[PDB]
Amino acid sequence: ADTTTVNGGTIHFKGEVVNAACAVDAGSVDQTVQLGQVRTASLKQAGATSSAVGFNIQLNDCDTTVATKAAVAFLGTAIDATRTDVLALQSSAAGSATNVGVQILDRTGNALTLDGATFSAQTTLNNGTNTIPFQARYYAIGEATPGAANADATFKVQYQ
Protein backbone atom coordinates (compact mmCIF):
# COMPACT_ATOMS: atom_id res chain seq x y z
CA ALA A 1 0.00 0.00 0.00
CA ASP A 2 3.11 2.20 -0.07
CA THR A 3 3.35 4.29 -3.26
CA THR A 4 5.28 7.25 -1.84
CA THR A 5 8.02 6.32 0.69
CA VAL A 6 11.19 4.43 1.33
CA ASN A 7 10.21 2.86 4.64
CA GLY A 8 13.22 2.47 6.70
CA GLY A 9 13.52 -0.66 8.75
CA THR A 10 16.96 -1.15 10.22
CA ILE A 11 20.59 -1.25 9.33
CA HIS A 12 22.16 -4.08 11.27
CA PHE A 13 25.86 -3.86 12.18
CA LYS A 14 27.92 -6.75 13.53
CA GLY A 15 31.58 -6.55 14.60
CA GLU A 16 33.19 -9.06 16.95
CA VAL A 17 36.82 -7.94 16.86
CA VAL A 18 39.15 -8.87 19.72
CA ASN A 19 42.33 -6.90 20.48
CA ALA A 20 44.56 -6.25 23.49
CA ALA A 21 44.15 -2.47 23.15
CA CYS A 22 40.44 -2.13 24.01
CA ALA A 23 37.28 -4.23 24.26
CA VAL A 24 34.39 -3.51 21.93
CA ASP A 25 31.40 -2.68 24.12
CA ALA A 26 28.74 -5.36 24.22
CA GLY A 27 26.18 -2.82 22.98
CA SER A 28 28.27 -2.18 19.85
CA VAL A 29 29.02 -5.71 18.56
CA ASP A 30 25.48 -6.39 17.31
CA GLN A 31 23.48 -3.18 16.90
CA THR A 32 20.74 -1.69 14.77
CA VAL A 33 19.96 1.46 13.76
CA GLN A 34 16.59 2.45 13.00
CA LEU A 35 16.63 5.64 9.46
CA GLY A 36 12.84 5.76 9.30
CA GLN A 37 10.81 6.93 6.41
CA VAL A 38 11.45 9.25 3.45
CA ARG A 39 9.19 10.32 0.58
CA THR A 40 10.52 9.13 -2.76
CA ALA A 41 9.89 12.71 -3.93
CA SER A 42 12.89 13.62 -1.74
CA LEU A 43 15.15 10.99 -3.38
CA LYS A 44 14.32 11.67 -7.01
CA GLN A 45 17.79 11.91 -8.53
CA ALA A 46 21.17 10.27 -8.20
CA GLY A 47 23.14 11.70 -5.32
CA ALA A 48 20.14 12.79 -3.25
CA THR A 49 20.47 11.95 0.44
CA SER A 50 18.20 11.93 3.49
CA SER A 51 17.71 10.94 7.11
CA ALA A 52 21.14 10.76 8.65
CA VAL A 53 21.04 8.91 11.97
CA GLY A 54 23.91 8.58 14.38
CA PHE A 55 25.45 5.44 15.80
CA ASN A 56 28.61 4.82 17.76
CA ILE A 57 31.14 2.06 18.19
CA GLN A 58 32.21 2.17 21.81
CA LEU A 59 35.55 0.85 23.04
CA ASN A 60 36.08 0.04 26.71
CA ASP A 61 39.13 -0.53 28.88
CA CYS A 62 41.48 1.11 26.40
CA ASP A 63 45.15 1.09 27.34
CA THR A 64 47.19 3.79 25.63
CA THR A 65 50.43 1.93 26.30
CA VAL A 66 49.04 -0.63 23.83
CA ALA A 67 47.54 1.72 21.23
CA THR A 68 47.15 5.47 20.87
CA LYS A 69 44.67 5.51 17.95
CA ALA A 70 41.73 3.53 16.63
CA ALA A 71 39.67 3.54 13.42
CA VAL A 72 36.86 1.45 11.95
CA ALA A 73 36.25 -0.07 8.52
CA PHE A 74 32.95 -1.46 7.18
CA LEU A 75 32.26 -4.39 4.87
CA GLY A 76 29.11 -4.87 2.81
CA THR A 77 27.65 -5.25 -0.64
CA ALA A 78 27.89 -2.20 -2.88
CA ILE A 79 24.60 -1.26 -4.52
CA ASP A 80 26.38 -1.35 -7.86
CA ALA A 81 29.90 -1.46 -9.17
CA THR A 82 30.17 2.32 -9.66
CA ARG A 83 28.92 3.22 -6.14
CA THR A 84 31.43 1.49 -3.86
CA ASP A 85 30.45 3.40 -0.68
CA VAL A 86 26.69 2.85 -0.99
CA LEU A 87 25.32 -0.27 0.69
CA ALA A 88 22.75 -2.30 -1.27
CA LEU A 89 19.55 -2.95 0.58
CA GLN A 90 19.03 -6.54 1.70
CA SER A 91 16.31 -6.62 -0.92
CA SER A 92 15.24 -4.62 -3.94
CA ALA A 93 12.62 -7.24 -4.85
CA ALA A 94 8.87 -6.71 -4.86
CA GLY A 95 7.87 -4.93 -1.66
CA SER A 96 11.26 -3.26 -1.24
CA ALA A 97 12.63 0.08 -2.42
CA THR A 98 14.83 0.39 -5.52
CA ASN A 99 17.44 2.93 -6.63
CA VAL A 100 18.37 3.77 -3.03
CA GLY A 101 20.99 2.47 -0.65
CA VAL A 102 22.65 3.43 2.61
CA GLN A 103 25.97 5.17 3.24
CA ILE A 104 28.09 4.99 6.39
CA LEU A 105 29.70 8.35 7.17
CA ASP A 106 32.51 8.75 9.64
CA ARG A 107 32.91 11.55 12.16
CA THR A 108 34.39 13.82 9.45
CA GLY A 109 31.41 13.37 7.13
CA ASN A 110 33.15 11.06 4.65
CA ALA A 111 31.39 8.02 3.27
CA LEU A 112 33.41 4.86 3.73
CA THR A 113 34.12 2.40 0.93
CA LEU A 114 32.52 -0.93 1.88
CA ASP A 115 35.63 -3.08 1.41
CA GLY A 116 36.45 -3.75 5.06
CA ALA A 117 39.73 -1.93 4.51
CA THR A 118 38.90 1.79 4.23
CA PHE A 119 39.28 3.14 7.71
CA SER A 120 37.45 6.00 9.33
CA ALA A 121 39.10 9.04 10.79
CA GLN A 122 40.89 7.91 13.89
CA THR A 123 39.90 8.44 17.50
CA THR A 124 42.95 9.46 19.53
CA LEU A 125 42.39 7.22 22.50
CA ASN A 126 42.23 8.03 26.17
CA ASN A 127 42.60 5.29 28.76
CA GLY A 128 39.22 3.72 29.43
CA THR A 129 36.07 4.43 27.44
CA ASN A 130 36.25 5.80 23.89
CA THR A 131 33.24 6.45 21.67
CA ILE A 132 33.76 6.45 17.90
CA PRO A 133 30.84 8.17 16.16
CA PHE A 134 29.30 7.53 12.73
CA GLN A 135 26.14 8.14 10.78
CA ALA A 136 24.08 6.17 8.35
CA ARG A 137 21.98 7.90 5.69
CA TYR A 138 19.99 7.13 2.55
CA TYR A 139 21.66 7.76 -0.83
CA ALA A 140 19.74 7.62 -4.12
CA ILE A 141 21.39 6.19 -7.27
CA GLY A 142 18.48 7.25 -9.49
CA GLU A 143 14.79 7.94 -9.06
CA ALA A 144 13.99 6.04 -5.88
CA THR A 145 10.94 3.79 -5.89
CA PRO A 146 8.85 2.98 -2.82
CA GLY A 147 9.06 0.05 -0.43
CA ALA A 148 10.82 -1.42 2.58
CA ALA A 149 14.51 -0.72 3.16
CA ASN A 150 16.81 -2.77 5.36
CA ALA A 151 20.57 -3.27 5.19
CA ASP A 152 23.45 -5.09 6.86
CA ALA A 153 27.17 -4.55 7.28
CA THR A 154 30.05 -5.78 9.39
CA PHE A 155 32.86 -3.75 10.93
CA LYS A 156 36.46 -4.11 12.04
CA VAL A 157 38.62 -1.97 14.31
CA GLN A 158 42.25 -1.11 13.53
CA TYR A 159 44.55 0.07 16.29
CA GLN A 160 47.95 1.74 16.16
Number of domains in the chain: 1
Q: Please state the three-class secondary structure of 1-68 as a single string.
A: CCCCEEEEEEEEEECCCCCCCCEECCCCCEEEECCCEEEHHHCCCCCCEEEEEEEEEEEEEECCCCCC
For 42, list phi and psi in degrees, rounded to 5: -90, -5
Provide the greatest CA pair distance for the chain: 57
Domain of residue 74, residue span: 1-160
Give the method of determination.
Answer: X-ray
Please state, in angstroms and as integers, the Cα–Cα distance from residue 106 to each residue in 55, 74, 146, following that order: 10, 11, 27
Contact call for residues 114 and 155 (beta carbons, < 8 A): no
- Beta partners for residue 148, in sequence order: 7, 96
Residue among 55, 132, 136 nearest 100 (CA): 136
Question: C-alpha dihedral over 147, 78, 106, 16, to 10 degrees?
Answer: 100
Residue among 1, 7, 83 nearest 50 (CA): 7
Q: How many residues does the chain have?
A: 160
List of residues 6+ apart from 26 with CB closer than 8 A: none
